[PDB]
Design a protein around this ligand. Structure first.
Ligand SMILES: [Cl-]
Ligand SMILES: [Mg+2]
Ligand SMILES: [Mg+2]
Lengths: 205, 205
C-alpha cells in the first residue's frame, strides 16, 4: 500500500462558502493490515482538525483509507505546505506526503468554445468543446451548463503544460443530436485564480 | 456630525483574495472638533484590528473621519454583527452604529440584458441595459465589460425591494453610437451569494 495526497478541489478553494480540503489516501491495503494512523501539519506545525473515513473495500477487493484535512482558502493560495504523515504496523517507518499550490505568477486562462465540427453534424450525437489555454497554475474547474442547469454528460482532459510553462485543457460536452442548432443554450463555466472575478462564462448555440 | 456605518463591498465579501471591510464614518465635523475615537466589536466582543484614516476636508469645507474594520468573508455571510462605537469631546455620550447582512434565504438573481430601445438607435450615444431581478439579500455587484476589459462608463441604480420581498437593479452602460451593432462585445458581470459559482455573465452585440 502506497500513500497519495491530493490537492483541494479548485472550485472549493475559490468559493468562500465551500470547504477546501487536502486528502491523504492509503490505497491497496490488505484486509489483514492494521488500521493506518494519519497525522497532519500545516507548514511543519501539526494540526488536529482532520477527519479520517472508516475504511472501504475497493474494486480489486483490497481497501483504501481516506483522511481529509479541511483548510482555509487563503492558506492554499498563499502557498502553505500540507504534510500527511501516515504509519501503522505494516510499515517499517512512516511515509510522509507533501502537497501545496504550484508556485509562480498566476496567469488567466483564455476560454474559447467550439461548436460541432462540420464533419460530425452528420451524426445523431454531437459534441461541443471548451478550449482553455494559457493558464497557470494548473488548478482549474471547468463545467458545462445546459441553459442554466448542471450537465453531467461532459469530460475534462487533465491539464497539460504547453511549451511556454502555461497549461491547457479541453472539455467535451456531448449532446444527442437535436439540441445543438435548434435548442437550449450551452455554457462553459470556468473557475481560476487568474480570472477577473475568478470566474467566466462562454456559451454556444 | 452624525455617524454612519457601511456594509462591505459585495464583491469583496465574495472573492477570497479581496479583503472585505466594514466602514464607520463621522461626517460633517467642524474644523474645531477634537479627533473622534473609534471602537469596534464583532458580536459584542471588541476587536482591535481596525485602521482609522487621518481626516479629510470634504466638499462643504467640513470634514469626515473614516475607520475601516477588515473582516473575514465568512463572518459577514454567517450574519455576525458589527458595531462601531465612536466618542469624543463634542459628544455628550458615544454614538453606536450597527450593521450586518440582511437575514433570510439567499435568492439568485435573474440577469437579463437589453440592447438599445428601437427609438434610441437614432442617436449618437446609446445605452445597453442589464436588468437584475429576484435576488436576496440586496448585496450585489454589477459591472460591465467591453470585450474583456473594464468599463467605467456605467451606472447601477440602488437595489429596490419588489413587492414579494426580493430586490431588483438596473445597470446602464452607455456607448457612443458605432460600437453596438458593428463592434466589440458587451458583458454584464454580476456577483451574488445566490448564484451558482457566485457569479454570472450575459453579453450583448
Ligand atoms: Cl467567486
Ligand atoms: Mg468482496
Ligand atoms: Mg477649504
Amino acid at each position: 500500500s502506497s500513500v497519495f495526497i491530493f490537492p483541494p478541489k479548485p472550485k472549493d478553494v475559490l468559493t468562500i462558502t465551500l470547504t477546501p480540503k487536502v486528502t491523504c489516501v492509503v490505497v491497496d491495503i490488505s484486509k489483514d493490515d492494521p488500521e493506518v494512523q494519519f497525522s497532519w501539519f500545516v507548514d511543519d506545525v501539526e494540526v488536529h482538525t482532520a477527519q479520517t473515513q472508516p475504511r472501504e473495500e475497493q474494486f480489486n477487493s483490497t481497501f483504501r483509507s481516506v483522511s481529509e484535512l479541511p483548510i482555509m482558502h487563503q492558506d492554499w493560495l498563499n502557498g502553505k505546505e500540507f504534510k500527511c504523515r501516515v504509519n501503522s504496523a505494516a510499515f517499517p517507518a512512516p511515509i510522509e506526503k507533501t502537497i501545496s499550490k504550484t508556485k509562480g505568477r498566476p496567469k488567466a486562462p483564455q476560454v474559447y468554445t467550439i461548436p460541432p465540427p462540420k464533419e460530425q453534424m452528420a451524426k445523431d450525437k454531437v459534441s461541443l468543446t471548451c478550449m482553455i489555454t494559457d493558464f497557470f497554475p494548473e488548478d482549474i474547474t471547468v463545467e458545462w451548463q445546459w441553459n442554466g442547469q448542471p450537465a453531467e454528460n461532459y469530460k475534462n482532459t487533465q491539464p497539460i503544460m504547453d511549451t511556454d510553462g502555461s497549461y491547457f485543457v479541453y472539455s467535451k460536452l456531448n449532446v444527442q443530436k437535436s439540441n445543438w442548432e435548434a435548442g437550449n443554450t450551452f455554457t462553459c463555466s470556468v473557475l481560476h485564480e487568474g480570472l477577473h472575478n475568478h470566474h467566466t462564462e462562454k456559451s454556444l448555440s
